[PDB]
Amino acid sequence: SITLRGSAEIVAEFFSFGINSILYQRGIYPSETFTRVQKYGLTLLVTTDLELIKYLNNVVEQLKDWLYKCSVQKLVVVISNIESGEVLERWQFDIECDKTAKDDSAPREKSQKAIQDEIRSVIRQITATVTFLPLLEVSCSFDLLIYTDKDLVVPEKWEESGPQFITNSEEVRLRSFTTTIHKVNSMVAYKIP
Amino acid sequence: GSITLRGSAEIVAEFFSFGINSILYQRGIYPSETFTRVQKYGLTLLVTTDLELIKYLNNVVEQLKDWLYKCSVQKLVVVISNIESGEVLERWQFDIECDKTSQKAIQDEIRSVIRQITATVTFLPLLEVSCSFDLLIYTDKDLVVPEKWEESGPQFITNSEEVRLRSFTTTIHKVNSMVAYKIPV
Numbered sequence: 314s315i316t317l318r319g320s321a322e323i324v325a326e327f328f329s330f331g332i333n334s335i336l337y338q339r340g341i342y343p344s345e346t347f348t349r350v351q352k353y354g355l356t357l358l359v360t361t362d363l364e365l366i367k368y369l370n371n372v373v374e375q376l377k378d379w380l381y382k383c384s385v386q387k388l389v390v391v392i393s394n395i396e397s398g399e400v401l402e403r404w405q406f407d408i409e410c411d412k413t414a415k416d417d418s419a420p421r422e423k424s425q426k427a428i429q430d431e432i433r434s435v436i437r438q439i440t441a442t443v444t445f446l447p448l449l450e451v452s453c454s455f456d457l458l459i460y461t462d463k464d465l466v467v468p469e470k471w472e473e474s475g476p477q478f479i480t481n482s483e484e485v486r487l488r489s490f491t492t493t494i495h496k497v498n499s500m501v502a503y504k505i506p
Numbered sequence: 507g508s509i510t511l512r513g514s515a516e517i518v519a520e521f522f523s524f525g526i527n528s529i530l531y532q533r534g535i536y537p538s539e540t541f542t543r544v545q546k547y548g549l550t551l552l553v554t555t556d557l558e559l560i561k562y563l564n565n566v567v568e569q570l571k572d573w574l575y576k577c578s579v580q581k582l583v584v585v586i587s588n589i590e591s592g593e594v595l596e597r598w599q600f601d602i603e604c605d606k607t608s609q610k611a612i613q614d615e616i617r618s619v620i621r622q623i624t625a626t627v628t629f630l631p632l633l634e635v636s637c638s639f640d641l642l643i644y645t646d647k648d649l650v651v652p653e654k655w656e657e658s659g660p661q662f663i664t665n666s667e668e669v670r671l672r673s674f675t676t677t678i679h680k681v682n683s684m685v686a687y688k689i690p691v
Contacts, residue, residue: 356539
């Protein structure tokens with residue numbers, strides 16, 4: 314059994330490792346930037362750069378918050394050529410949320426194993442994605458997007474931003490894990506050569 | 507759907523290998539740590555490193571590289587089925603575009619395949635039980651095919667835990683033959 318207490322966390326945790334494993338599997342940050350660790354029963358890499366750690370701790374944390382409340386539905390990783398500004402790759406996580414859970418008599422029935430396994434297969438897929446994605450050879454920087462309700466108060470630093478879709482694109486839809494309180498559809502979108 | 511492998515023989519085999527590999531990875535048939543990244547044709551590819559499999563996937567692919575140099579094999583079909591159940595779980599079908607026998611060319615081919623395989627694994631349910639592989643080499647009713655290859659086929663077992671796969675077996679199914687004609691007038 315599992316509760317909003319934690320299902321908020323599980324998904325936040327996912328975004329940490331995912332965003333890391335995206336950044337590493339892409340060439341966003343240097344390969345030696347990251348360290349080899351165990352989670353979900355795979356070996357993923359998380360970053361070492363203090364700047365990037367402090368950064369992600371803030372987002373993983375801020376998401377944990379909003380997930381509890383069901384404010385956030387989209388999280389996007391926008392990979393853009395820092396030389397030009399142009400967008401080259403775009404990882405997009407849709408978050409179907411079950412509002413009627415704050416009000417649940419009993420915790421949902423679903424083993425840790427279950428959920429920690431649906432993910433093992435998502436992350437696993439994102440990894441095998443490496444073949445057909447085009448290679449980023451220009452200096453690229455990333456950026457997060459969070460989609461949320463107008464009916465929410467967001468800390469002062471954030472600010473409204475264009476969607477930044479890819480001029481000429483090709484998407485590929487991926488597996489979707491779910492805690493029964495949060496479903497996360499994941500799909501990548503690359504620039505057609 | 508079904509994936510189309512176009513090319514000469516020395517190649518189409520290698521492609522099959524890359525695909526049947528990707529399937530084993532993304533479906534968690536073997537573990538994650540079973541595999542490794544290797545680069546060939548300027549691409550990165552996931553391939554397995556369990557010696558059992560390599561031996562087997564090799565002998566079957568070599569014999570396939572052969573039947574192919576003359577376009578005798580029409581389609582390969584992989585049939586992941588529950589091992590006690592019997593019930594099929596999913597089929598992976600490869601249609602062959604046979605050419606009897608630069609690099610930008612190959613490159614695009616591999617991608618379309620891995621990309622196909624990948625977009626597919628999206629819609630499949632999670633696997634959760636033990637299971638058997640059944641490779642089906644579909645060939646011309648006529649063939650140098652040794653008797654053993656048909657019906658029983660060569661196979662291997664792995665009772666060792668940590669691996670979904672339990673038996674992988676190949677078998678040749680001879681069906682008909684095709685001849686392309688024109689009609690100049």
